[PDB]
Scaffold this active site. Structure first.
Site, mmCIF file in Angstrom:
data_model
loop_
_atom_site.group_PDB
_atom_site.id
_atom_site.type_symbol
_atom_site.label_atom_id
_atom_site.label_comp_id
_atom_site.label_asym_id
_atom_site.label_seq_id
_atom_site.Cartn_x
_atom_site.Cartn_y
_atom_site.Cartn_z
ATOM 1 N N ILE A 2 0.831 -1.200 0.000
ATOM 2 C CA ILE A 2 0.000 0.000 0.000
ATOM 3 C C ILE A 2 0.864 1.249 0.000
ATOM 4 C CG2 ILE A 2 -1.625 1.353 1.390
ATOM 5 C CD1 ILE A 2 -2.885 -1.445 2.168
ATOM 6 N N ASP B 75 11.260 3.742 4.983
ATOM 7 C CA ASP B 75 11.065 2.319 5.233
ATOM 8 C C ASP B 75 12.225 1.806 6.068
ATOM 9 O OD1 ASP B 75 10.532 -0.681 4.714
ATOM 10 O OD2 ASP B 75 8.964 0.300 3.517
ATOM 11 N N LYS B 76 11.940 0.781 6.884
ATOM 12 C CA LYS B 76 12.985 0.116 7.650
ATOM 13 C C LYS B 76 13.809 -0.833 6.793
ATOM 14 C CE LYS B 76 10.554 -4.023 9.186
ATOM 15 N NZ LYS B 76 10.285 -4.936 10.335
ATOM 16 N N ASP C 47 13.249 3.483 10.711
ATOM 17 C CA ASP C 47 12.364 2.599 11.457
ATOM 18 C C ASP C 47 11.494 3.489 12.338
ATOM 19 O OD1 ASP C 47 11.225 0.909 13.391
ATOM 20 O OD2 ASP C 47 12.978 -0.394 13.475
ATOM 21 N N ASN D 166 1.657 4.970 7.115
ATOM 22 C CA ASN D 166 1.267 3.695 6.532
ATOM 23 C C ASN D 166 2.002 2.504 7.126
ATOM 24 O OD1 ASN D 166 0.380 1.848 4.040
ATOM 25 N ND2 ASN D 166 2.633 1.794 4.148
ATOM 26 N N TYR E 201 -3.891 -6.831 16.708
ATOM 27 C CA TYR E 201 -3.949 -5.995 15.513
ATOM 28 C C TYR E 201 -5.197 -5.125 15.503
ATOM 29 C CZ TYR E 201 -4.092 -4.718 10.550
ATOM 30 O OH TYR E 201 -4.142 -4.043 9.349
ATOM 31 N N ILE F 101 -6.576 -5.695 0.793
ATOM 32 C CA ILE F 101 -5.804 -5.144 -0.316
ATOM 33 C C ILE F 101 -4.709 -6.148 -0.651
ATOM 34 C CG2 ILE F 101 -4.472 -3.174 -1.156
ATOM 35 C CD1 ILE F 101 -7.334 -2.432 -0.279
ATOM 36 N N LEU G 39 2.276 -8.379 2.090
ATOM 37 C CA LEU G 39 1.832 -8.891 3.379
ATOM 38 C C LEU G 39 0.709 -9.900 3.200
ATOM 39 C CD1 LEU G 39 1.869 -8.830 6.409
ATOM 40 C CD2 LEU G 39 0.335 -6.841 6.362
HETATM 41 N N1 LIG Z 1 -3.008 -5.385 3.045
HETATM 42 C C1 LIG Z 1 -4.223 -5.220 3.579
HETATM 43 O O1 LIG Z 1 -5.181 -5.941 3.286
HETATM 44 C C2 LIG Z 1 -4.414 -4.133 4.597
HETATM 45 C C3 LIG Z 1 -5.724 -3.875 4.978
HETATM 46 C C4 LIG Z 1 -6.001 -2.845 5.856
HETATM 47 C C5 LIG Z 1 -4.971 -2.092 6.356
HETATM 48 N N2 LIG Z 1 -3.705 -2.356 5.980
HETATM 49 C C6 LIG Z 1 -2.580 -1.513 6.546
HETATM 50 O O2 LIG Z 1 -1.867 -0.946 5.478
HETATM 51 C C7 LIG Z 1 -0.497 -0.744 5.883
HETATM 52 C C8 LIG Z 1 0.423 -1.369 4.865
HETATM 53 O O3 LIG Z 1 0.039 -2.753 4.735
HETATM 54 P P1 LIG Z 1 0.641 -3.634 3.544
HETATM 55 O O4 LIG Z 1 -0.323 -4.728 3.308
HETATM 56 O O5 LIG Z 1 1.033 -2.745 2.428
HETATM 57 O O6 LIG Z 1 1.947 -4.227 4.237
HETATM 58 P P2 LIG Z 1 3.368 -4.671 3.671
HETATM 59 O O7 LIG Z 1 3.984 -5.569 4.723
HETATM 60 O O8 LIG Z 1 3.254 -5.254 2.308
HETATM 61 O O9 LIG Z 1 4.188 -3.325 3.568
HETATM 62 C C9 LIG Z 1 4.524 -2.641 4.789
HETATM 63 C C10 LIG Z 1 5.753 -1.802 4.572
HETATM 64 O O10 LIG Z 1 6.053 -1.111 5.808
HETATM 65 C C11 LIG Z 1 7.413 -1.310 6.122
HETATM 66 N N3 LIG Z 1 7.582 -1.228 7.565
HETATM 67 C C12 LIG Z 1 7.246 -2.174 8.499
HETATM 68 N N4 LIG Z 1 7.632 -1.883 9.718
HETATM 69 C C13 LIG Z 1 8.253 -0.650 9.580
HETATM 70 C C14 LIG Z 1 8.901 0.197 10.500
HETATM 71 N N5 LIG Z 1 9.098 -0.110 11.786
HETATM 72 N N6 LIG Z 1 9.406 1.362 10.037
HETATM 73 C C15 LIG Z 1 9.284 1.643 8.734
HETATM 74 N N7 LIG Z 1 8.712 0.918 7.772
HETATM 75 C C16 LIG Z 1 8.216 -0.227 8.260
HETATM 76 C C17 LIG Z 1 7.766 -2.667 5.530
HETATM 77 O O11 LIG Z 1 9.175 -2.847 5.411
HETATM 78 C C18 LIG Z 1 7.012 -2.599 4.202
HETATM 79 O O12 LIG Z 1 7.770 -1.985 3.156
HETATM 80 C C19 LIG Z 1 -0.385 -1.301 7.308
HETATM 81 O O13 LIG Z 1 -0.578 -0.250 8.256
HETATM 82 C C20 LIG Z 1 -1.557 -2.275 7.378
HETATM 83 O O14 LIG Z 1 -1.985 -2.478 8.725
HETATM 84 C C21 LIG Z 1 -3.406 -3.343 5.114
HETATM 85 O O1 LIG Z 2 -3.010 -8.267 6.643
HETATM 86 C C1 LIG Z 2 -4.145 -8.721 6.525
HETATM 87 C C2 LIG Z 2 -5.328 -7.828 6.664
HETATM 88 C C3 LIG Z 2 -6.547 -8.181 6.096
HETATM 89 C C4 LIG Z 2 -7.641 -7.348 6.205
HETATM 90 C C5 LIG Z 2 -7.497 -6.164 6.881
HETATM 91 F F1 LIG Z 2 -8.539 -5.310 6.955
HETATM 92 C C6 LIG Z 2 -6.304 -5.780 7.471
HETATM 93 O O2 LIG Z 2 -6.178 -4.609 8.151
HETATM 94 C C7 LIG Z 2 -5.209 -6.624 7.352
HETATM 95 C C8 LIG Z 2 -4.356 -10.181 6.239
HETATM 96 C C9 LIG Z 2 -3.771 -10.781 5.133
HETATM 97 C C10 LIG Z 2 -3.986 -12.130 4.929
HETATM 98 C C11 LIG Z 2 -4.768 -12.838 5.822
HETATM 99 C C12 LIG Z 2 -5.317 -12.167 6.912
HETATM 100 C C13 LIG Z 2 -6.094 -12.876 7.959
HETATM 101 C C14 LIG Z 2 -6.841 -14.015 7.667
HETATM 102 C C15 LIG Z 2 -7.511 -14.704 8.661
HETATM 103 C C16 LIG Z 2 -7.446 -14.265 9.977
HETATM 104 O O3 LIG Z 2 -8.060 -14.932 10.991
HETATM 105 C C17 LIG Z 2 -6.715 -13.118 10.284
HETATM 106 O O4 LIG Z 2 -6.651 -12.699 11.572
HETATM 107 C C18 LIG Z 2 -6.053 -12.431 9.280
HETATM 108 N N1 LIG Z 2 -5.121 -10.850 7.115
HETATM 109 O O1 LIG Z 3 2.459 -9.230 -3.780
HETATM 110 C C1 LIG Z 3 1.082 -9.075 -4.107
HETATM 111 C C2 LIG Z 3 0.901 -7.662 -4.845
HETATM 112 O O2 LIG Z 3 1.502 -6.623 -3.989
HETATM 113 C C3 LIG Z 3 1.246 -5.303 -4.545
HETATM 114 O O3 LIG Z 3 1.815 -4.338 -3.687
HETATM 115 C C4 LIG Z 3 1.881 -5.183 -5.954
HETATM 116 O O4 LIG Z 3 1.504 -3.927 -6.522
HETATM 117 C C5 LIG Z 3 1.503 -6.307 -6.867
HETATM 118 O O5 LIG Z 3 2.366 -6.286 -8.015
HETATM 119 C C6 LIG Z 3 1.564 -7.642 -6.246
HETATM 120 O O6 LIG Z 3 0.886 -8.597 -7.098
#
Ligand SMILES: NC(=O)c1ccc[n+]([C@@H]2O[C@H](COP(=O)([O-])OP(=O)(O)OC[C@H]3O[C@@H](n4cnc5c(N)ncnc54)[C@H](O)[C@@H]3O)[C@@H](O)[C@H]2O)c1
Ligand SMILES: O=C(c1ccc(F)c(O)c1)c1cccc(-c2ccc(O)c(O)c2)n1
Ligand SMILES: OC[C@H]1O[C@@H](O)[C@H](O)[C@@H](O)[C@@H]1O
Ligand SMILES: NC(=O)c1ccc[n+]([C@@H]2O[C@H](COP(=O)([O-])OP(=O)(O)OC[C@H]3O[C@@H](n4cnc5c(N)ncnc54)[C@H](O)[C@@H]3O)[C@@H](O)[C@H]2O)c1
Ligand SMILES: NC(=O)c1ccc[n+]([C@@H]2O[C@H](COP(=O)([O-])OP(=O)(O)OC[C@H]3O[C@@H](n4cnc5c(N)ncnc54)[C@H](O)[C@@H]3O)[C@@H](O)[C@H]2O)c1
Ligand SMILES: NC(=O)c1ccc[n+]([C@@H]2O[C@H](COP(=O)([O-])OP(=O)(O)OC[C@H]3O[C@@H](n4cnc5c(N)ncnc54)[C@H](O)[C@@H]3O)[C@@H](O)[C@H]2O)c1
Ligand SMILES: O=C(c1ccc(F)c(O)c1)c1cccc(-c2ccc(O)c(O)c2)n1
Ligand SMILES: O=C(c1ccc(F)c(O)c1)c1cccc(-c2ccc(O)c(O)c2)n1
Ligand SMILES: O=C(c1ccc(F)c(O)c1)c1cccc(-c2ccc(O)c(O)c2)n1
Ligand SMILES: OC[C@H]1O[C@@H](O)[C@H](O)[C@@H](O)[C@@H]1O
Ligand SMILES: OC[C@H]1O[C@@H](O)[C@H](O)[C@@H](O)[C@@H]1O
Ligand SMILES: OC[C@H]1O[C@@H](O)[C@H](O)[C@@H](O)[C@@H]1O
Ligand code: NA
Ligand code: NA
Ligand code: NA
Ligand code: NA
Lengths: 257, 257, 257, 257
Positions: free
Chosen positions: A17, A36-37, A58, A85, A150, A183, A187
């Site tokens: 994201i 980023d860390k 970090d 983020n 979380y 999304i 992760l």
């Molecule tokens: N992926 C989802 O479905 C989802 C849904 C809702 C909310 N979010 C939130 O969106 C944000 C990003 O999620 P994502 O799925 O892109 O995760 P991701 O793990 O793919 O990317 C997270 C990034 O943050 C960096 N990071 C982690 N710890 C750090 C630190 N201490 N200092 C600096 N950078 C750090 C990581 O190195 C990485 O580049 C998070 O806050 C997550 O809770 C994600």
């Molecule tokens: O990072 C995740 C996530 C998923 C949805 C979110 F709204 C969010 O803030 C974070 C994620 C990714 C893949 C699987 C899961 C997940 C699936 C089943 C679970 O019981 C759970 O706690 C998390 N969460």
């Molecule tokens: O790793 C799953 C997905 O992560 C996203 O952040 C990237 O934009 C995609 O290219 C990738 O498919």
């Protein structure tokens, strides 16, 4: 041109994201500091994007964040928007499998890192009438299974966004959050790979939304650019980017006993 | 260019929030059909804006709305977005001063007119993977004094938005609403003029927001363009454009008796 | 008789809301363990109320909480309800006057103490099909001025309540929260005494509610007894005990600039 | 004894949730007037319950409701609580299968009937410092598939509850709503019988709740007695009786396209 001349800091901007938010702001004309860390993704993004630079930071280390802000000001002369983020979702964990220690560590990243950068950035945001965008989660609002720590961290972020919006309103600084749903990010892919049936987990994640797919980092990024550049009467809002996952009924003797 | 090549219908687009939405969509590159029951504002807007035309249409008259849709298709060949903005706030009325008849009439405008245009437009929105934007109100969510019928109509609009989002999701049609707070419009000015102290009423309206001012039609318009053009993972959301009015505590023997 | 034969633990039960909850449960026929870090109020309450005993316990000390649970089981043989009420509101503090260290300490009390007791109590609550009641706050939902850390802790509690409700539903253990508004307690009186005009602060606190008064500990207690004894289809809810403070508009050049 | 000496009117009290509310109030010591448009269930309930009498009344007929109130006062001398429960859910209907006419008729029952009785009862509720309880629905808040008119009516009821709470607060009259989820009632059974696989529909309805069952009329009734008798600081609240259906994720190419 929508955010031309502005300077934006995105934490955790090296992938997922965060990288989508970085790209959206660069495409809007802003200069972007990628925090980023981890070096790998963010360094490559800096090479790829003219308007973007990478600073290793970090967000849990107060001195890293102090240097992030001072370097942004030294290099670009202003600060208009902070996007908090950086964050992490642990693997699914039953409540009895969690620990207070792990909960504290997740609070340090998901909540206190957002607090620390915002505090250090606010004097500069006041000068620019800038804004704060926190990346929370839909699950802070509706809950999630196997994720007590979380969910708690994201409920805190959304609430803190409203409190800070009240406090900074007299200074013209808006404070908003985006609550994404599922999304597709690295992760999500990493957590799915740990599951018994990764493909079934990914399918269940797609089907949790009425739209039938997960969201993209670019979609969160567009919401962030809107909040920064065109939402001048929005403060303290929670902008849902969830594909409708919160809507309607889903799959969660006598029928009533 | 953000919504270039698209065709948008805005109801009540002749003044106020509706006119701000019309302007925002024209500035995004869209062609806009201004619907209004009154000729004055909308005809002038059509002369002023190249990308906009005016069609006289009372949204409570089913045949007016049928002709609105058929004329839009005949003249522009497609329909991408319907903005259901036409609506009215009656003067402040104590509950015992309201009537079931007046409540029904307000439902006809604020709720059923939105329902009717949406229903007639949906076959065309499905072909274009278009979207619906309903203009609800913050007071549907939090209530308002001396406004039982109005509040009820807006609670209905916000809820209906979520139901329709669920139903249209398999067809790729998103359905969202914007809930403005106090926006400075001719309606606001007209209602203030009826008050004992109009200036004091306007001041109280400005101070209901932490931002210390009312909102602008242009700000609602920018939120509408975002929902139409850049919110592809948003459906069934309520986008608050309120200046923070819903946040925090405000002015609403023993201290607890 | 409504909760006869049941055993309830109330944290911070020595005064204020907690004492009101203790009284409500005793009046319902339950045996109540009063937990508090301070001896004064809770010891007197144990002498006053036949069905109540006092156990000195600081909820931030894991070993205190372990002994609280083991002593409750040793003395009463079962555990049916845990009310996580212990918590604190710091004096009003501008965001730049807060610290990460103070934020962590407030998280320890308001969030982690609730987490720790709940975790230790859950094996016994599963045996009794008991329930958890967390005392959160309206301000977790709507924000509050000069209270960034406090608001964040309560947003976390409300969210955590929903997550834990999901996790414990297969075991028949319900998890709910109460979000009070302004309740007249010793904390409210102490904070008011620090203000420039204490009487004006108390008056403003009363007038924040449409009901025109603050709430009573007994009113929070009645909501808690309802959730424990008669809400068998309620889990993960946030029960507002606020006097309507969240409703309607309140007091928070050109009118729109 | 919890509501002894009080007089309660329950609309649609002849079966289902309404009958459960009638029973709960009789068990609390109240005298109850059962209003229903159908004689069968309500007449039997009057014979069964000493503290209950039946008055034939269609809430959509203003003169029926006038006589309901005047007869309640003539026979019992006071009025303390009105429970607006009468309502209907049509069979599942796609949006293009609905009509404005059917929508208006459903508004007459689900919304305007509640408005009319409340208006006629309010002068008596002011004398007794009584209260209003509206039976809304969870789906007013989160939406439901194939139910655009129904969802809209319940969003209106919940919003109207908040507006009326604001207006009646200076008179000491509280106005609250209960939003049930899936409750096993004759309506639920009738709608299920129309489905292709009735047993599969009933199973899906049970599994929509984390608790794994539907709710009971008695559970809604207990929530109503709480709101009437023990919630003196609650006004304008929406009390969820849903089994957790609104919590968490459920079942609603590239994973993100
Ligand atoms: N992926 C989802 O479905 C989802 C849904 C809702 C909310 N979010 C939130 O969106 C944000 C990003 O999620 P994502 O799925 O892109 O995760 P991701 O793990 O793919 O990317 C997270 C990034 O943050 C960096 N990071 C982690 N710890 C750090 C630190 N201490 N200092 C600096 N950078 C750090 C990581 O190195 C990485 O580049 C998070 O806050 C997550 O809770 C994600
Ligand atoms: O990072 C995740 C996530 C998923 C949805 C979110 F709204 C969010 O803030 C974070 C994620 C990714 C893949 C699987 C899961 C997940 C699936 C089943 C679970 O019981 C759970 O706690 C998390 N969460
Ligand atoms: O790793 C799953 C997905 O992560 C996203 O952040 C990237 O934009 C995609 O290219 C990738 O498919
Ligand atoms: N102004 C605010 O503070 C505010 C706040 C929240 C929501 N809203 C909503 O925004 C919308 C617009 O409000 P406004 O303040 O701009 O009002 P306005 O009265 O200034 O403008 C409303 C426009 O709609 C037109 N209209 C009215 N009835 C119509 C009908 N039957 N058919 C077609 N057009 C019709 C009017 O002629 C006018 O041009 C309404 O839905 C209102 O409820 C306004
Ligand atoms: N008073 C209000 O207006 C209000 C409003 C909303 C929520 N709340 C919440 O209600 C709860 C009680 O508030 P109150 O106003 O009654 O406060 P209070 O200060 O009057 O009483 C709190 C009690 O908790 C005890 N306590 C504090 N720290 C403790 C610890 N570490 N271990 C054990 N006991 C501890 C105190 O000694 C005291 O007896 C808190 O969680 C507060 O956040 C209060
Ligand atoms: N059953 C559920 O799952 C559910 C869920 C949420 C909300 N609700 C709401 O609860 C209420 C009761 O639902 P139910 O499932 O018990 O329904 P039901 O059909 O079993 O019972 C409704 C009762 O209301 C009466 N009634 C209908 N129209 C009336 C009128 N015009 N005047 C007077 N009485 C009238 C009927 O004769 C019947 O006795 C409704 O408002 C419904 O929308 C039900
Ligand atoms: O149209 C108005 C409005 C104001 C705010 C809204 F959120 C909304 O949807 C509509 C408006 C304009 C001017 C005064 C008022 C108003 C003031 C006091 C009242 O008691 C009231 O019911 C309405 N409302
Ligand atoms: O403890 C208090 C409180 C008040 C309301 C709440 F909902 C809550 O959870 C806690 C309290 C008591 C007295 C004054 C205040 C207060 C007043 C002004 C403030 O700016 C502030 O942050 C807090 N809060
Ligand atoms: O009356 C019903 C109901 C169900 C849940 C509610 F919250 C509510 O307010 C009403 C009900 C009963 C049986 C089936 C259904 C139903 C099932 C599938 C549907 O698509 C639908 O619109 C309704 N609703
Ligand atoms: O009438 C009050 C306001 O209404 C808005 O719609 C217009 O854009 C303003 O020019 C005007 O000041
Ligand atoms: O100290 C303010 C209030 O605190 C409450 O907990 C007590 O029940 C009251 O007796 C007291 O007036
Ligand atoms: O008809 C389905 C259910 O409706 C409820 O109102 C009744 O209390 C039950 O006896 C019945 O099983
Ligand atoms: Na670069
Ligand atoms: Na034109
Ligand atoms: Na005792
Ligand atoms: Na009888």
């Amino acid at each position: 041109t929508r955010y031309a001349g502005k300077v934006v800091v995105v934490t955790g901007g090296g992938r997922g994201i965060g990288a989508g938010i970085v790209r959206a702001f660069v495409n809007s004309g802003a200069r972007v500091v990628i925090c980023d860390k981890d070096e790998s993704g963010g360094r490559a993004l800096e090479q790829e994007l003219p308007g973007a630079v990478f600073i290793l930071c970090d967000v849990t280390q107060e001195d890293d964040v102090k240097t992030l802000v001072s370097e942004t000001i030294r290099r670009f002369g202003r600060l208009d928007c902070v996007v908090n983020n950086a964050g992490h979702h642990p693997p699914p964990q039953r409540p009895e499998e969690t620990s207070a220690q792990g909960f504290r560590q997740l609070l340090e990243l998901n909540l206190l890192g957002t607090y620390t950068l915002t505090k250090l950035a606010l004097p500069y945001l006041r000068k620019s009438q800038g804004n704060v965008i926190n990346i929370s989660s839909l699950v802070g609002a509706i809950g999630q299974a196997q994720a007590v720590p979380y969910v708690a961290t994201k409920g805190a972020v959304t609430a803190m966004t409203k409190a800070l919006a009240l406090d900074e309103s007299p200074y013209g600084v808006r404070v908003n959050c985006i609550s994404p749903g599922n999304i597709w990010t690295p992760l999500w892919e990493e957590l799915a790979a740990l599951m018994p049936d990764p493909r079934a987990s990914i399918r269940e994640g797609m089907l949790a939304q009425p739209l039938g797919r997960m969201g993209q980092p670019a979609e969160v990024g567009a919401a962030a650019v809107f909040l920064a550049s065109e939402a001048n009467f929005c403060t303290g809002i929670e902008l849902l980017v969830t594909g409708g996952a919160e809507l309607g009924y889903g799959c969660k003797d006598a029928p009533d006993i």
